[PDB]
Each structure stands twice: as structure tokens, then as C-alpha cells.
Paper text:
[name] (PYK) is the last enzyme in this pathway that catalyzes the production of pyruvate from phosphoenolpyruvate (PEP) and plays a crucial role in controlling carbon flux; however, while S. pneumoniae PYK (SpPYK) is indispensable for growth, surprisingly little is known about its functional properties. The overall structure of SpPYK, which consists of four protomers with three domains, shares the structural organization of archetypal PYKs. PYKs require divalent cations for activity, and they are either K+-dependent or K+-independent depending on the active site residue being a Glu or Lys, respectively. This residue is Glu93 in SpPYK, and we found that both Mg2+ and K+ are necessary for the proper function of SpPYK. In contrast, only a modest activation effect was observed upon G6P addition, and the kinetic profile remained sigmoidal. These results demonstrate that FBP is the primary allosteric activator of SpPYK.
We successfully obtained SpPYK crystal structures in all ligand combinations including apo-SpPYK (2.0 Å resolution) and PEP/FBP-bound SpPYK (1.8 Å resolution), which provide insight into its conformational movement upon ligand binding. In the ligand-free structure, the side chains of Arg380-Ser397 and Thr455-Asp456 form hydrogen bonds that stabilize the interaction between the two protomers. In the apo-state, Ser321 forms a hydrogen bond with the universally conserved Asp325, and our result indicates that this interaction could be crucial in maintaining the inactive state of the enzyme in the absence of FBP as it was not present in any of the FBP-bound structures. Ser321 forms a hydrogen bond with Asp325 in the absence of FBP in SpPYK, whereas this aspartate interacts with the conserved arginine in the apo-state of M. tuberculosis PYK.
Numbering used by the authors:
A (entry chain D), D (entry chain B): 21 to 521
B (entry chain C): 22 to 521
C (entry chain A): 2 to 501
Write the structure that this text describes.
């Protein structure tokens, strides 16, 4: 059984050795990164089922990210397996300012009335809370009375009862008991704070990633198609047109514009943590299911992310709720599941990938019976779409061990993936950009091949590579799909059902 | 293109003797004109006849041999090949001659008369004698309460008692009617043990095989044995290519239909005799059931007899006849047949043209009203998966044509069975396979050189389709085959090709 | 129980005059023997005739009136009620008498002759004159290239030129044939401005309404206005219960089918005239399409003319005719019709019996082969939900009978439209609603006293069904109604009951 | 919007007042339970959506248990809504024995070799752990080499490496660093230890509960139909045949015998806690989905229980994973969701019930598009199936506000509930036992009424009670379904679609 659901693992210090020291050891940050020893740790994550590594530019500097990318390239060589490289942008942020007198935090009681300062370069007082806004942006004009200001992952709520134009301050009433600590995340739901579509930090981070060599960009806090289009303009301008963009839907404006965002993007990353703060908690499961169904309808890639196996950061076993949550992401029809802190900063990065691989493989067995996505609903206009449907019907009607597609661009692999056939998909391609770019599509095993000289040669190569890969053995039935004639840019128009010899 | 195939029975109706047309006096006086007759037969081929039926029920071997030769010339004039089908005489019961050379007698309802079972004797007014094929004694096979029907079921005699001394049936005339000499007799629901293959029929088949035929229609099939005995002769004479259609005409054949379909290559629904042998209201029931069951087995079904009966004497068919041909197509028939309308009628060409027009009109309603259902077939096999995919492709896109390169014709029969909304061009490498596909629904058989590889095979499919005028630049076709094309393998490859 | 209804046309074939039968000498001189004629008509009722058609194309009001009176006696003898349907004459064109009192002339293909439009002149071999209804001048309504068809479409005349000086058409004979005096004329694809309702049809309808009828079949309906003018007379005279069947006989009626179906209560598919007025191969196409659309509208369709035509002179139908009646049932027709077979033939009782047998046998195949599909209807209202539920019960379980108590017949018509796999007993409170349901598919109309509560309604439904002999102890029935049944409300209640 | 998914809340000190002392107050346990004060707290749980309370008879003497039941009866009057009374049996257990010398516990290192004794009535030593087995069974022949012995809710693993026939001891190896304390739960996965059906005290506990008036029994650790049949025999012999039995599926043998258990029982409680210990963690979601489908197919009640909102035991909000877990149990097709520690011993018992109610109501809105149960799948060849299917089709085809049934036994209500119509089900019954017995059926609102005199009266009562309950108003469409005549135990045979006046 091959794992059809792809795993995105976030890389961090958890797998990194410095001067023989492991993360958390005293003096760890005082040593140079040990590249070959760290690469051996990352190869184990590849072997356990990580299909793509996420480089989170929210933390660290470019030199750390570049070294990490170099460590993965060595790990691919050690493991003898390739992975996708995904860049995650920092995006806009609002943080709690510093407190006067060096005070770490203040505890507040419901009904207590305090103020929120929009002026930048000011410290916070227990009475008045100061906001560090990205770009030192003035948000006073963009928050309406009745809005909510939430502090530290939505734990504390301040209702905006009044605005004082005299000091550009928010007059709020505490809604629930809690603590306001310094440098804490702030979210103001259902606001349209005018952070620019593409900030200079995000521009630097994307151009750096593009130069290092990446296959995917996950764009943080996408609110409209423009946030996707500004990034696409950079990929096309720099001659990186192959790079695929995943919009991170984390707030109500993003949900409101989901159809236009899906059209612009190559996929969606569902960020459940931030989405849970920005929208009513009971709607997250609704938005997750709806987003997965719509992205699959568009033949695009969806990643379910954040809070998947979070307890495995500190514990070797996940909770029943966490196992259920990952399992149900697969049944919902996700292409990929993601690990953040569990793989980047946790005590059990290898166990976290292994656990997610085990849940994903188990869930894939129920996809035939309990799977939510339904291929019959699709509109098959293009001949290529018609062929993908026939492949799906073959895998439904007969015991098909593998679907083999010869694809110069990967387009046919993506169309077959979209139908969720009851078989693994071997995508034979001729360049590394296409190979790595298919690493997050459901069920796709990308592999490099030699070019066929004829249609008969192509059928022979398809069976030979499947056997050499260990995917099938004599008596197994496979479906082979290709554009004929084979040399040219002929779209996939041929299907053959073959018994492996 | 007409997807439903037409079988036309040949007879004197199209033959020119000297310079005289059928029905002119002294016609039988004149010698047969081969070239003039072939020109007329060619007109039937252009009109849409796909196979000619040689009825060994009438005429002799010399007569059958001369007509088969005339069709071969007609193929050349027309420039289109047709199938050759032999229809056997098979088992019959006829009324005997009357003593004193009387022609016939009339009877009234309620009269008590007798039917003799003794063979080689003459009838009398009071005692009708039967000429049973093989001079069988049928006295122990007919029970009291059975019915004896004379002259195409017109006059009924109810068996009320049996007389062991004379071995006679005591009968009651059920209706006013006439019993004439040499008229057909039917005893429905009886198992008269006619041999599986009689010597006369064995003889006729061996003669037709010698002349060269593609199909045999076996009259009055009652069990698989009847089909299997003819299969043995075809195999022994090196004629394994011949396809056998069992003619279902009576209750015993209907009761053993599953075993007969398994033994045969197809079924000819003989509505004339079936309407006598079973209740008249059951004929539409058996026609629909047989067409469905034959299509389920992937074999050929012919709907035959009285399709455009009135066109034997009149230039236009009845509303009922048009409805009957049309509904045969809707039921899912591979082929419709003409007997007297083409064999000895006043309008043989008009009958083929009328049948072709109704058949072509009916094929346009198959998508919405068609009674066959391709989704009903088992889909856990490579073959069923490919055919289903091909049918799905023709439904989802506007595919004009399905093309196959087939050594044996299996891919063509497989696609035909699924009844795609497209013509099927079957490119084959021998004349035996080519004429053998002439009665398969939607199949246009064509001869070509075997291809050297899968790419060559794809190129030949597109080239022949364009050459035949079946498709043009920018048209989409589906090419289906068992690769490799030289080997004999299950259909396993499909390609949707945009004709450039 | 026969689900498909039979319309039998009454005529002299069942009527005995002073002990004489139709055709014998001085038959028309004798007064009609009412009791002897009523006994003959009662046998047609017992054989399965559900409605009698009185064709006002032939005879006078006195002959029609005495015939309608005779049926009332036949209902008493049979112990069974029947519907009364009036068929209008409508617009006609007939060839005129010839000079020298010649009866007819024979013509050959390619001959050139003329057709006069002037009214009140005799024909010559060279110049055919017409009797157009109302003495309408049709010269401006017929374009060159149109066809003039004579005698049930047997002889075709192509209009090749128009002479403005004599207002004559120059025509070319298209086929060998005869023009006889007083023969029907059809000019396909023309819009001759016959009134929407001619005075003669107004007189015939008002006469029938006075006598007491349940249905009117309106001849040659071209637009909804033809239906609405008849509806106005029915409402004006207090005969708003009377249901109108539009006869679709020509291209204009087919072109306006959707508006005609909305105006009428049903459609009579007049295959005879339709086969002349449209291409012969399209008649089956229009027949299936019309049956589907009328069923979709929840209205009644009658398939008419030439169903068992040969039974006019012969005691058995052809295989094609049996197939034709059988497939009308499979297409989804509510009713089949007999014209000359029952009105003027030698075998009126046999024709009704043969049609009943075919119809009964065909209904057993509706589940597997029926073209109508109740799943196609939209299901967003209570009435559609209840009918779909009744149908599902008859599909899922072995339901013998659906029983409704209905003031207006709405629940019966709704269930009939869904074609359940069960007979429908419709218990109603008045003879007009009862007779008005006699052409709906599967409905057995019966009179009953209105119930005093829902519990009383349920016991009456079971008690009448058991006493009618429709179901027996342990059979399951479905009871459907608009509770409370005394009011005219939407079908809203269903019960599955095991009969005691 | 009426909550269709039912909530079972476990009773505990968290809502209980003792001598004016709230839980976690010094001298709390010394005080008597306060009936009136506690009833006011429990009433709030009822208003928030609790449909049944779960009682455990092991904590406190019967006098006190009687008091606790009296409080809930008082709370019903206060909230103005009736609730079901569920008793949870202790069931058979293995517990670690006392240690010699009063040692409370010992700690062990991975790879240590110790022993597990099978002899009964003896003390543990550090190197020889003794067991207290229900029924005083000898388990030596029931546990093969290679089996695992788990101590304290699966926290410490002991692998059986060998067996000693002279002492009848298991030689085991410590799998992970941990503690073995006295009186701790022991699990031996994939074994068929033939435990008695009930704990020694369960027979007395059940008999007391039946005297007090309970509607449901949840039978712990059911492995065969035999375990359900023993409890049924107690119910029938005391004249309490109305009591519904829920089998708790906690182990592999229970899953293997699921068909026979569902047949013997009135429902299944999926005990995810014990199941998580006894079967591989990744299979729990598989078994949860299969159990929900099979119980629904049998027209019986399923309860999904354990760790639904566990973090709300100590924190005011649930994790994203917990919200997802509760939501997906509804989509899977569960009749009810259950709270244990969250309502029994937690800091936020009321908030736990409100949060579960919010998630369940939100999830029921997605059942039409994403629900995994498939009513079309059911056999449709009987009158009862035909009628239920017609009601479901009516609610699918039309805007049906309510399905109303008048039922003597509750059969029509359980039949409609099984089909999961897109409407609430108002079940009018004639006795309190039938009314309380329907409290856990999906979407059923049980209500008391007088028997009708005729079919027309039954139709009038159905509409009038619905209007009175405030469930519908004039112009709303309702479906009325019943077995006429409703005075008898007849099969559902009548349906009417009625516009409310």
C-alpha cells in the first residue's frame, strides 16, 4: 500500500545538529549547522513519507533558510528520493507592544473597560494597550465600533464600544477573563485592514526562495485574487512560471472571495489555526469541507494545515481527537496534510511524520466507501478530461494496481489525480521541475523517464518503469495513458489496459 | 449511414429471363439473362441490402447455384460486397394429395373429421393425411386437446379423441375453412422428434458451403443439438468461418432459447411460423426477449417475415408495417429481413428502399427510446471496460465514427453490442472476416493490409476513414483495437484522434 | 384487468334492422331492432370496450341519436357503464363528380393535368374539380411544389404551375393511380383557412351534448383556437365536465402541439390522416413524441386508426398489426382505438377481443420495456410527492390495487399519469366523473356514497375493492386521497392496507 | 433550528453542591449532597441541550445515588424539559493489586525484566505484579507469548517474552519508562479473557437503579451477546422490559462480534477511551464509522463517547481537533454525543454542554450534502420501509418543517429517526416510559398526549400539539405518519402532508 495523501513537513531546528548539539542543548545556537548530520535526520523524514518540506519565512533569516534548503538537497541524495520545496510567506501581523516598567503581562476581568492605542512606537500600559502593526500602519480608521479585538490566539476578547478621535484610541470593554501579555498575536475579525497585497518583506522572501529553487509558495493571509496575482507576476517576471501558488485562507475576506482566489491560485492551504480565530469556531469544519470540495472541482491541490498532531510537539502519542481530525481530512478529500511545530520544533519530528503517514494510509482504504469527493459530478469538456474519466471507470470496474501516465507537463497526472482513481498514479516525466511540482497531487508518484521512440516503445517503457520501481509484478493489471504520437505536444488521447508480464 | 442491416431474400422477382420481367406470360419459357439480372440485384445492394438470403425451401441446387453466381457479378457492378446466407428447408408437415386428384374441400365449424398419421397415403374429404418429413409416425406425440392447424394457421382442428385401430386423430373443425392439398400444417406445443439434422438439410448445407456462403439460417431449431450438428459439418469441410443463426419458430425452441443462443452465432426471429406455433399476442413478447438476450450474448439477431408484407402486391406499406419495422429497430435488432417482398413481389427495389428509410429514421431515436441497455452488462473485465469507455466517449463528445483494425472481427462485434451513437468501420485482412461482419449492427466492414506496429495501425485507421468519405479534417474518431494487432488478443487499447 | 382503454367506433356492423344484418338487401329500409342491437353492443362492452365513438363524418343525427340510445340499453344488459365519445367531421376536400357520370379515371406517371379551384363544377379527366368545405377558394393557399394527394394518399399530384386566368393548378401525376369521384383530398404543409369551428361541427357537437356525451374528439385541430371554440360551447351549455381530445392529423397541428395539449384534455393520434400529411417514416416518431408529451401534461392520449385494419374483412390480424397495437401500449398510450373494424367490419366482437388480448399482454411488459418514465417528472409539490410514493410502493412491494375516493377524479388522474404497476380503482360520487375517467390508463371507475370520515373512507375503499373481486384476503392495497374527500383538495394522504 | 443530535452528559461533583460547598472546596466531600442547589445547576445543562444524564453507582452509597436521581428529577421541573436517565455499569476489570509493605507505586526503566502473577488474592512486589481479576479468573492460559500487558490507561507497556508454568507467572519486559501504582486499570489487548458480564456489585447497582427508575443501561466491556442477554434478563425479571440496553464496545473481541451484539442490544456506545488502548490508534476512526453505519442500518441508537471535548475539562475553549472530532461524529451519522469528565469533574461543565450543542447544530446543517449515512441503501420491500422512505422523500422534495407521529410504543419515531429526514420528529406518546425512552433517538422530540379516538382526531392532535409546542405556525407544511389505528401496536402504515392552519 503506497500512501496517496501527501505530507508537507515544516523544517526547523528539531532535526538540525550544531557542533554535535541537539536543539535545546546549552550552547546549541553558538555552533555552525552540521550539514551532513542534519541531512541524515531529514532523510529519515523523507523515508517515513514526507513528500514536501515547508520553509517558513515567518522565523529565521535568509541564510538559515538557504542552509536548510541545502541540507534537504543532501538528504534527497542520501535517501535516494526527491521532495518538493515549499516557501511559506510571513504575511501581515499585529502584535502586542512592549509594556512600561518591563511588566510581562496584566490579568483582566470581564466588564473592565480599557483602551487600545493605534499610534506606533509607543509602549503599552495596563490601562492602554499599544499595537505593533506591520509597516507601522495606522489601523484606527479601518476598525468599526462593535468589532472585536482578540489577543493571543483568540484567548482574550475586547469589544470596541467607542473610538476616541482625540488620541486615535479604541474604547473597548473586556468580554472574558484572561491575560494580555507583550508581543502577543492580535486578530480583528471581519475587518479589511489595508495591508498591501505584496509587502516588501514578502517580496524579498519570495525572490530569495525563487533564486534558491522552490516548487511551491504558500501565500499567507490571502484576502482577494490580487494577493495571488502580485506573487504570480514575480514568478512570471523572474522566469519561474513553473512555481505553483497556494493561497492561505485564514479569514472572512478570504472565504468571501474563495471562488476568485481558487481561479488565480494553483491550490489552497487551509490554515485552521488562524481561521478558527477569524471565524466562529464551529464553522471551521464547514469551511474545511467546502474548500476541499471546491479546490478538487477546479483540479487544484488542497493542503489541510495547522493543529493536526500538535500534542506530538511535547508527547510521543497524539490525542484521539487529533487522530480523528487527520483521518477526516483524508475522507474530506484533501490532497495533502501538513505538520508545523510537530516536525519543525518538536521533540518527536520523525514519530510525527510516521504517525501522520499511518493515519493517512488507513483513511485511504475508506475512500472508496466513505469518501466525500464524487467524480461523477465533474463536467468533461476536453478530450483529456474524457480520458481521465475513462481511467477512473477502469479503476472502479476492475482491480487496477497502477495508472501510468507519460506526461511532459504533468497536466494528465493532475487530471487523473482529480478523479481520485482507486489506484496509485505513476507520472513519468522528463524534467525535475515537473517531477517535483507533482509531489503534492493526491496519489501521484512522479518519476523521471527515458523518451519513447514510438507508441509501442512507450507502452514497453511504462510497464518496465512500474516493475523496476517495485510498484507492480506479473499478473497485475495497469492502465497506461499517453498523447500519441509521443514526440510532439499531443494532449493525452490514448488508453491501454495491460497485464504486467 | 444505415446502422441496421437488411437481409433480402432473392427470387424470380429481380431475375430477367430472355428480356421478360417476372409475371409476364412465357417468362418461365425464356432462358435466364445473367447480366440483366445482376444489374437489378446491384440496385438492391445500392438501396441498402447487406446480405442475400438463398431459401433452399424452394427451387433446386441448380437454381440456388445459378442465383449465387448472379449475386457475385452484382457485387462487381455495385462495387460493394454483401453476405451470402443459406436458409434450410428443415422439418415440415404438409397436407397430402387427395384421392381422385381433388384440389380441396370446404368444412363447417362443428364437423367431426379425422387426421391420419399413416405415411405414404392420400387424403380423403373425411380423413386428412399428413406428409411428415422423414415419414415419422407422430401418433404417440400428439395428445388429446392439442390443435392441428392447416394452411398458415387459417383452419383449426381440435384433437378430441384418438383411434388406436386406424392410428387417427378424431378432430372437430374449430372454424369454417378449406383444406387444400400440399398446405403447411402446424401442431403447436408438441415435440415431434424430427432429427437434429435431416439428410436433405445436411445435403443442402454441403452444396451451399461448396458454392461459398457466410451464414446459415437453420429452420425450426428446437435444441442446441440442431445447431451443433450443422457446426460439425462446417468444421469438417474447413468452413469454421460460417456463422449459424438458429430460427426460433415454436414453443420448444423458445423453452430451450438459452442453450440455443449459447450454441449459435445468432437468432433469426421467424414471426410467420412463431405466430402459428404460439399465441399471436405472445409474438411481440418473444421478439423483445430474444433481441435483448441475443444482444446480451454479443450475437446477431435478425427480425424476419411479414415486415412489409403488403408491398408484395402494393407500392406502399400499411401504417402497421412501418410501425413494426421501426419498432424492431427500437427493440434493438441488428438486422431486418424481407422475404416475398423481395423474392417474388411486384416491388422488390421499392421494398428494400422503404425498409432502409424506416431503419435509418428509427436509428435516430435509439438514444432516447432504445430498449437495449449497455449499462446492464457485467463490467469487471478488460473487454467490457474498453467497450464501455468507447460508448462513453461517443456519448460525451460528438464522435462521428469508431474505427477498429481486427484480424478476427472480435473488436467490431464487441463495439457493435454496446450500440454506440456512431458508425463502426471494421478494417479486416481477409474476405471471410469482412463478409462475416455484414449483419452486425452499425458495422461497415472494409479490407486492408495488416499493420506493422501500433503507430502504423493508428495511421491506417485514420487514412481509410478519410478515404471512405466517412470523416474529414477536424472530425474526432475513436480507434479501438487489441494491441498488438497481429496477435489475437482481447480489445485493450482506445485512442480519441482528431482527424488532421 | 386491462389497463389500456379501448375506444370502439359503433356503426351498422353491430346494428340489426328488422332481423337483417348490414349488407343484406333492404337493410336500410327496416327500422332498427333496438334490443337485438343492444345485445350485440353489450358483448363489445363485456369484451373490453371502455368508450364508444360516434363518428359524425357519416349518417344523420337520427341515426347517431338512435345508436346512442341503443348503447344506454346495452349498458343495462352488460351491467357495465361506458364512455360516449363524439368524433366531428371537420374540414374536408373531396374530388367532384365527373361529367358523363364517369366513376373514375386511370393515370400514368408523368401525365400533366389540372386541378380547378372554382367551386360548383364537375371534373373531367383533364381538369379535376374539388368540393372544398365552405366552397373555400384554395388557389392563394397552395404554392407551386406542394403536393395534392388523392384517395388516402394513394395518388400524388405535384403542383408544377399556377394559372391566374382560370385559378387552376397544373400538376404532374407522380405515380400510376386512379382519381375516382367523391374521394378524400389532402394537400400537405398548407394552411387552408378552414374556420376554427365550422357551423356543421357546431351543429354536430350541440346535438351530441343534448344526447349526453363524455368526450369530443375534434377533427383536424391546427391551433389551440380550434379547441377553445369547442370548450366555449361545452361551458355555455352546462357541459363543462365534457373532455376535449384534439385530433393531430397534419403538420400545422404538430407544429402547434404544445399549445394544443395545454388547451385540450387529451390528444387523439389520427395515424391515417397523419400518414398522408407527413412523411410515412415519421409517423412512429410523432406517435412516440406525442404520447410522451401528453403523459408529461397528465392528459389522455388515444392511438387511433389502422390498428387491426385487416380484421375489417378477415378474422385474424397480421403480425404487423399485432406488433402495432402492442408497441402503442409500450410507447405509453392511455387508449387504443378501433374504427372500421368495430363500425363496418365482418368481425366487430372479434376485433375488440383481439385488441383486449394484445393490450392485456403488453401491460405485463410495461415495467421492463415501457418508454414512459415517471422518474422524469419534477417532484417539488405535495401532489407529485404523494404520487411518486404510491408508485414507489407498487415498485417496492407487490401492490395489487391502488384505491382512491375522489370527488373530481383528480387523485385518479394523478396516479394514472404515474403508470403504477397496479390497477387503479377510482371510487367517485357522481356518474359524470365516473364516465369521464373511463379513458385514463389503468382506472376502474365505480360509483359510491361519500364517506362520513377518514376512517369511513378507508373501510369503503377496502370493502368496494374486495366486493368488486379486484383483491382478496391478505392482498396489499394502497389507499390514496385528498382528505377530506368530500372537499376538492390536493391528494395528501396515503395508507398501505392488508385486505381482511 | 432544533438540535437533532442528542447529548449525554455525565453527572459528577462539577455541577453538584454539597452543604453549600462547591467542588474543590475544603470539607466538600464531608458535606451531604444539596438537592435544591444542585438541581438549579443541572437545569442549566438541560436548557443548554443535555438530553440524558449518565450515572455511575460506584461513587457513593445508594442513599446518595437516590438523592442524585431526585436532583435530576427536580432539575427537569426547573428547566421545563424531561431528560433520560442512563446508568453505566462498572463491568469486569483487571486492577493491579496492593503492594507488600504498603508501597503506593514503583517506577521502572525500559528493558527491565519483571513478572506478572496470575494467582488471585495475593499482594504485588516490585518485581512481581499481582492482578485483581473480575470473577477471580486465572488468565494464564488466555495470554500467549508476544501479547502486551498495559497498566494505568495504557501508559506503561509490559511485553510477555516468556511464561513460567511452575509459578503460573508471565515473564515481561518494560517497554517504556513509567510507574506501576496499586489499584490501576490493566488491559491485555487481543485476548479473550472470559470475564463475567458484570462487576460483583453491578447486579445490586442495576437493581437499585431500576427501583429508582432509569430508562437506559450502558453495559461496560461487552464482548459477546451473552453480556447483553444477562442484563436483559435482570430487566425483564423485575418488570422493567422498557429499559434500553447500550453495549459498550471497548476491545477487539467486541468489534469481531459486533453483528451479534447489535442484534442483542438496543444500541451501542462507542467507548473511544478503552478502544484506543485495546486496538491500534489509527483503527479507532475506522471502527467508529463502521459501528455508526451498522447500528443505523439496524434502526438502533449509537452514542459516540470519550475525549470529545477533553481539553474543556481545564480550559474555557476546545482545540480545533476536538471541534472537528465532534462535528465529524455528527457527519458519520451518530444519534448522540457524550461528555464524561468535561461535565462530571471539569471546570466548565455548562460551557462544555453549550459548545457541544453549538457544534452538533452546525453539523446537522451539512448532513444533506456531506452525511455518510445512506438511507437509499436500505432494503425497500416492506410497508414500514416504503412509508419511512416516502416521509424522507417528502422532506427532501419539499420544505417540511416537522414530521409528527402519534405512537403507543415509539416504533414509528425510531423508524423515521433511522431515515434521518431533513426535519425534526415530534413523537407524541401516551406514557412517560415511552417518552423518556426516545430521548437519545436522532431528531426525536418526545411529548406526552392522550390517545386519539379516531384517525381524524389523530390528525387534529398532531397539528395542534405541534403548533402548541411552538415547533410550527400557520402556513408551515408538516408530515403526519402513524400506524393506524394508533391505539394498537401496528406497523407504520399511513402518511399525510398537511399545511398547518
Amino acid at each position: 500500500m503506497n500512501k496517496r495523501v501527501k505530507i508537507v513537513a515544516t523544517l526547523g531546528p528539531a532535526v538540525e545538529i550544531r557542533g554535535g548539539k541537539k536543539f535545546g542543548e546549552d550552547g546549541y545556537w553558538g555552533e555552525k549547522l552540521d550539514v551532513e548530520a542534519s541531512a541524515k535526520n531529514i532523510a529519515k523524514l523523507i523515508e517515513a513519507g514526507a513528500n514536501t518540506f515547508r520553509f517558513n519565512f515567518s522565523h529565521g533569516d535568509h541564510q538559515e533558510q538557504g542552509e536548510r534548503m541545502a541540507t534537504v538537497k543532501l538528504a534527497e541524495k542520501i535517501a535516494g528520493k526527491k521532495v518538493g520545496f515549499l516557501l511559506d510567506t510571513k504575511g501581515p501581523e499585529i502584535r502586542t507592544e512592549l509594556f512600561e516598567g518591563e511588566a510581562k503581562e496584566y490579568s483582566y476581568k470581564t466588564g473592565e473597560k480599557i483602551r487600545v492605542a493605534t499610534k506606533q512606537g509607543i509602549k503599552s500600559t495596563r490601562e492602554v494597550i499599544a499595537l505593533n502593526v506591520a509597516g507601522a500602519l495606522d489601523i484606527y480608521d479601518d476598525v468599526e465600533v462593535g468589532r472585536q479585538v482578540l489577543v493571543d490566539d483568540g484567548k482574550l476578547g475586547l469589544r470596541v464600544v467607542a473610538k476616541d478621535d482625540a488620541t486615535r484610541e479604541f474604547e473597548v470593554e473586556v468580554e472574558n477573563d484572561g491575560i494580555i501579555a507583550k508581543q502577543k498575536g492580535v486578530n480583528i475579525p471581519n475587518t479589511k485592514i489595508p495591508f498591501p497585497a505584496l509587502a516588501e518583506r514578502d517580496n524579498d522572501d519570495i525572490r530569495f526562495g525563487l533564486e534558491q529553487g522552490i516548487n511551491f509558495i504558500a501565500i499567507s493571509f490571502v484576502r482577494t485574487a490580487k494577493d495571488v496575482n502580485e506573487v504570480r507576476a514575480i514568478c512570471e517576471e523572474t522566469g519561474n512560471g513553473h512555481v505553483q501558488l497556494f493561497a492561505k485562507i485564514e479569514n472572512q475576506q478570504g472565504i468571501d472571495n474563495l471562488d476568485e482566489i481558487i481561479e488565480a491560485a494553483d491550490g489552497i492551504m487551509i490554515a485552521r489555526g488562524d481561521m478558527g480565530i477569524e471565524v466562529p469556531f464551529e464553522m471551521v469544519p464547514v469551511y474545511q469541507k467546502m474548500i476541499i470540495k471546491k479546490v478538487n472541482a477546479a483540479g487544484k491541490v488542497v493542503i489541510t494545515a495547522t493543529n493536526m498532531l500538535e500534542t506530538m510537539t511535547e508527547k510521543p502519542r497524539a490525542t484521539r481527537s487529533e487522530v480523528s481530525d487527520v483521518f477526516n481530512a483524508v475522507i474530506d478529500g484533501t490532497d495533502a496534510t501538513m505538520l508545523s511545530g510537530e516536525s519543525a520544533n518538536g521533540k518527536y519530528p520523525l514519530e510525527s511524520v510516521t504517525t501522520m503517514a499511518t493515519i493517512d494510509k488507513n483513511a485511504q482504504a475508506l475512500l472508496n466507501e466513505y469518501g466525500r469527493l464524487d467524480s461523477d459530478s465533474f463536467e468533461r469538456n476536453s478530450k483529456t478530461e474524457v480520458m481521465a474519466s475513462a481511467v477512473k471507470d477502469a479503476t472502479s470496474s476492475m482491480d487496477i494496481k497502477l495508472v501510468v501516465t507519460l506526461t511532459k507537463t504533468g497536466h494528465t497526472a493532475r487530471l487523473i489525480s482529480k478523479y481520485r482513481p482507486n489506484a496509485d498514479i505513476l507520472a513519468l516525466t522528463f524534467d525535475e521541475l515537473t517531477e517535483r511540482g507533482l509531489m503534492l497531487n493526491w496519489g501521484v508518484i512522479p518519476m523521471l523517464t527515458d523518451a519513447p521512440s514510438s507508441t509501442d516503445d512507450m507502452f514497453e517503457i511504462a510497464e518496465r518503469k512500474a516493475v523496476e520501481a517495485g510498484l507492480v509484478e506479473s499478473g497485475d493489471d495497469i492502465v497506461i495513458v499517453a498523447g500519441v504520437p509521443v514526440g510532439e505536444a499531443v494532449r493525452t488521447n490514448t488508453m491501454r489496459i495491460r497485464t504486467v508480464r
